[PDB]
Amino acid sequence: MKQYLELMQKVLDEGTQKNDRTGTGTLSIFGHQMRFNLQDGFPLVTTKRCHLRSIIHELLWFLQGDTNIAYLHENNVTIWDEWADENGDLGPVYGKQWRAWPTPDGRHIDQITTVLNQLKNDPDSRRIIVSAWNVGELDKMALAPCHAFFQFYVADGKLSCQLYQRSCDVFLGLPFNIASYALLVHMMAQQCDLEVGDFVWTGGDTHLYSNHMDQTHLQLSREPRPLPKLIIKRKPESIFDYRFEDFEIEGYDPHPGIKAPVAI
Amino acid sequence: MKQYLELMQKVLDEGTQKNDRTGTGTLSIFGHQMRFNLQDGFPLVTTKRCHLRSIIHELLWFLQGDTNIAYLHENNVTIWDEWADENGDLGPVYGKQWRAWPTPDGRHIDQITTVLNQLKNDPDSRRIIVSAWNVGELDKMALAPCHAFFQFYVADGKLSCQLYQRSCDVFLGLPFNIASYALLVHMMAQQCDLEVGDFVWTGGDTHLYSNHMDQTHLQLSREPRPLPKLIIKRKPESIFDYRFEDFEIEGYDPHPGIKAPVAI
């Protein structure tokens, strides 16, 4: 997509040499922002084929709040397998914070129901936020949330959403991060009888791994294709009742998929 | 400052009509980002005189962690007076979360000491974060944190910091928000023997109140002056031992101060 390729080129042009926790070198910049008008089309990268099956199941699983990977395994979605323990547990990652953030007094706060309620009853609110950055629970999580917090906003009948992503692998994760939250904006908007606005992506440590340099140069030589269109085939009674088959991406005509490896 | 005036003009050119909780109308945009290279000079607005005495005391008070306003009152700093109850209490706002975030198991987490430790011992970390968005404590706070969370980053001997501000009054608060966090970057860098990098400001609901429209037009007719220089007169033994008199702003030559009123 134009904004995504511009970010890639920017990391290449001005990223500084920087290692990760494993020791794998990266080129990195700190602080970046992109805006996708969801009325322009579903923001799925077209310069490489990106599959969404895993992403759709992951979002449904996030919304359900149980952090054991059983549901993902029932659907053969293996993207969380490397972090799960022997029982399929991950600790209180994303979903547990979204749906049942634990307080000091023993309550479990459902942030998704809170924001839905706020979008329907107080759309002007400047505090329609969901955070997964539960400081007291970080140590128990299999990994700290990368997509740490997000805020909603309503103007002129349109729902917008901004995500703060503390750490972003531009090549491997970003395309999926964008699509995930874009999908969630469509779902929230549908549930609040709103049109879709913009998805604003904000990044913290934004990087390209050095072993993704060939892939990055190849992707940069391709021209973005017209964006596809998200169609929601059914309107569920609530944000917790969406099903995998409700979503269809129409008009996706990407350039070929590009594999990128990870070090261990 | 150039970036600040550009944001003002942008809100004017494309902000949509939007009320606040009180009902005071605003012009607002959602999602904006600015970058200030702290080696270029201390980012204190020059298109209107901005006083920092209250801001310096507020930062010291944040760092100390006690949310009663007694220390502010001892120094005749009255900016939190409108939110304080009869005893001078505010509930667990900023400082309590920065220094003693309460967990479900009864611990109090010092995020400032955690990040300092992380900057000294693991500068490549992509999770050097401080959050004041403690979902379980929001109801007890006199008001929810506007400057909600911030992340640090180290590259080439320089400390950078990104702030996510969920709601920003461009005219009245922004100049002070920038200066506050810029000061904190200088202090953290000094304590970690690092040079200053960039302060990245990210905004959520970013607005101009309609009763600030004359002031905004007047400020926009002024040309930014060269930035001033922050001087720290002493190097304290820790981040908790800074004193008001340690800070001096040199070479500040602003255009005249501009008053802006608030509705009640």
Side-chain angles (χ1 to χ4, degrees):
Chain A
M1 291 176 282
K2 188 177 160 212
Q3 295 191 94
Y4 178 85
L5 298 178
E6 290 179 57
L7 170 58
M8 277 194 152
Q9 191 62 61
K10 186 176 219 262
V11 180
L12 284 181
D13 297 344
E14 30 213 80
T16 187
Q17 255 159 257
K18 198 167 186 279
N19 300 133
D20 74 352
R21 184 173 185 192
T22 297
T24 316
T26 72
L27 277 181
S28 152
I29 61 183
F30 181 64
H32 187 87
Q33 186 175 87
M34 302 186 287
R35 178 178 309 264
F36 306 94
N37 179 343
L38 300 178
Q39 255 149 35
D40 292 345
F42 188 82
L44 183 66
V45 165
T46 64
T47 46
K48 81 173 183 197
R49 184 184 306 280
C50 294
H51 296 297
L52 298 186
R53 172 191 126 80
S54 289
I55 300 327
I56 296 164
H57 280 295
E58 183 189 46
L59 181 57
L60 302 175
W61 171 71
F62 283 157
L63 285 169
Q64 204 46 53
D66 178 354
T67 53
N68 185 278
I69 62 176
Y71 163 84
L72 299 182
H73 278 182
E74 289 165 30
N75 289 285
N76 202 26
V77 166
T78 56
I79 63 177
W80 278 92
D81 284 14
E82 71 176 299
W83 301 106
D85 67 17
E86 308 256 3
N87 287 291
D89 290 312
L90 294 167
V93 294
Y94 297 107
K96 164 73 177 319
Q97 300 317 319
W98 288 17
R99 298 300 315 303
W101 169 297
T103 69
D105 61 337
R107 296 172 293 148
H108 285 89
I109 302 308
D110 180 355
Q111 296 187 80
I112 299 294
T113 291
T114 300
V115 297
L116 226 18
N117 286 346
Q118 295 174 291
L119 290 164
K120 295 173 175 187
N121 305 316
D122 182 25
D124 287 346
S125 184
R126 304 154 165 165
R127 47 184 286 183
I128 305 177
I129 292 170
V130 172
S131 181
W133 198 263
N134 190 334
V135 188
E137 303 250 271
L138 294 171
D139 297 355
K140 298 279 196 210
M141 290 182 197
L143 72 170
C146 291
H147 39 103
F149 152 134
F150 49 104
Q151 170 180 13
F152 290 95
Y153 167 100
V154 180
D156 304 321
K158 294 171 171 212
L159 183 63
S160 287
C161 172
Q162 184 165 16
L163 168 74
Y164 186 92
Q165 180 161 346
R166 67 171 179 88
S167 172
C168 174
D169 176 335
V170 176
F171 192 89
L172 242 27
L174 186 54
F176 299 125
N177 297 121
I178 296 168
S180 190
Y181 279 91
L183 201 73
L184 181 65
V185 178
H186 278 264
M187 294 157 75
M188 296 288 283
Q190 182 176 231
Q191 292 299 312
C192 293
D193 306 304
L194 296 173
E195 295 299 307
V196 298
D198 294 328
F199 167 57
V200 181
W201 180 85
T202 291
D205 181 329
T206 304
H207 48 82
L208 281 172
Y209 277 94
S210 47
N211 67 337
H212 296 171
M213 291 304 161
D214 294 344
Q215 294 88 341
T216 296
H217 288 297
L218 169 64
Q219 202 169 354
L220 286 167
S221 79
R222 305 174 168 180
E223 278 287 318
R225 308 261 171 89
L227 296 166
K229 181 181 160 35
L230 172 66
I231 96 123
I232 306 188
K233 291 165 147 151
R234 183 178 72 95
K235 175 176 190 179
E237 172 150 324
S238 93
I239 189 71
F240 305 118
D241 299 321
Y242 283 85
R243 304 188 288 233
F244 182 86
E245 68 262 23
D246 291 335
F247 312 93
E248 198 204 326
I249 298 289
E250 169 180 300
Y252 185 52
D253 179 40
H255 291 258
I258 306 160
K259 169 170 288 161
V262 305
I264 55 176
Chain B
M1 291 176 282
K2 188 177 160 212
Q3 295 191 94
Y4 178 85
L5 298 178
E6 290 179 57
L7 170 58
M8 277 194 152
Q9 191 62 61
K10 186 176 219 262
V11 180
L12 284 181
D13 297 344
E14 30 213 80
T16 187
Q17 255 159 257
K18 198 167 186 279
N19 300 133
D20 74 352
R21 184 174 185 192
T22 297
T24 316
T26 72
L27 277 181
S28 152
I29 61 183
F30 181 64
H32 187 87
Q33 186 175 87
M34 302 186 287
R35 178 178 309 264
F36 306 94
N37 179 343
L38 300 178
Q39 255 149 35
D40 292 345
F42 188 82
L44 183 66
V45 165
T46 64
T47 46
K48 81 173 183 197
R49 184 184 306 280
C50 294
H51 296 297
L52 298 186
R53 172 191 126 80
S54 289
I55 300 327
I56 296 164
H57 280 295
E58 183 189 46
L59 181 57
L60 302 175
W61 171 71
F62 283 157
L63 285 169
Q64 204 46 53
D66 178 354
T67 53
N68 185 278
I69 62 176
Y71 163 84
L72 299 182
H73 278 182
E74 289 165 30
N75 289 285
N76 202 26
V77 166
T78 56
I79 63 177
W80 278 92
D81 284 14
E82 71 176 299
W83 301 106
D85 67 17
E86 308 256 3
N87 287 291
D89 290 312
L90 294 167
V93 294
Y94 297 107
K96 164 73 177 319
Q97 300 317 319
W98 288 17
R99 298 300 315 303
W101 169 297
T103 69
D105 61 337
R107 296 172 293 148
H108 285 89
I109 302 308
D110 180 355
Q111 296 187 80
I112 299 294
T113 291
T114 300
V115 297
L116 226 18
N117 286 346
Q118 295 174 291
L119 290 164
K120 295 173 175 187
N121 305 316
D122 182 25
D124 287 346
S125 184
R126 304 154 165 165
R127 47 184 286 183
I128 305 177
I129 292 170
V130 172
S131 181
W133 198 263
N134 190 334
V135 188
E137 303 250 271
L138 294 171
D139 297 355
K140 298 279 196 210
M141 290 182 197
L143 72 170
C146 291
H147 39 103
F149 152 134
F150 49 104
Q151 170 180 13
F152 290 95
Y153 167 100
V154 180
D156 304 321
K158 294 171 171 212
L159 183 63
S160 287
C161 172
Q162 184 165 16
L163 168 74
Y164 186 92
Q165 180 161 346
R166 67 171 179 88
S167 172
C168 174
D169 176 335
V170 176
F171 192 89
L172 242 27
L174 186 54
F176 299 125
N177 297 121
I178 296 168
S180 190
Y181 279 91
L183 201 73
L184 181 65
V185 178
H186 278 264
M187 294 157 75
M188 296 288 283
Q190 182 176 231
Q191 292 299 312
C192 293
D193 306 304
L194 296 173
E195 295 299 307
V196 298
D198 294 328
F199 167 57
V200 181
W201 180 85
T202 291
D205 181 329
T206 304
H207 48 82
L208 281 172
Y209 277 94
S210 47
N211 67 337
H212 296 171
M213 291 304 161
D214 294 344
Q215 294 88 341
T216 296
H217 288 297
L218 169 64
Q219 202 169 354
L220 286 167
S221 79
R222 305 174 168 180
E223 278 287 318
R225 308 261 171 89
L227 296 166
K229 181 181 160 35
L230 172 66
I231 96 123
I232 306 188
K233 291 165 147 151
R234 183 178 72 95
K235 175 176 190 179
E237 172 150 324
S238 93
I239 189 71
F240 305 118
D241 299 321
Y242 283 85
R243 304 188 288 233
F244 182 86
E245 68 262 23
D246 291 335
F247 312 93
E248 198 204 326
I249 298 289
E250 169 180 300
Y252 185 52
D253 179 40
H255 291 258
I258 306 160
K259 169 170 288 161
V262 305
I264 55 176

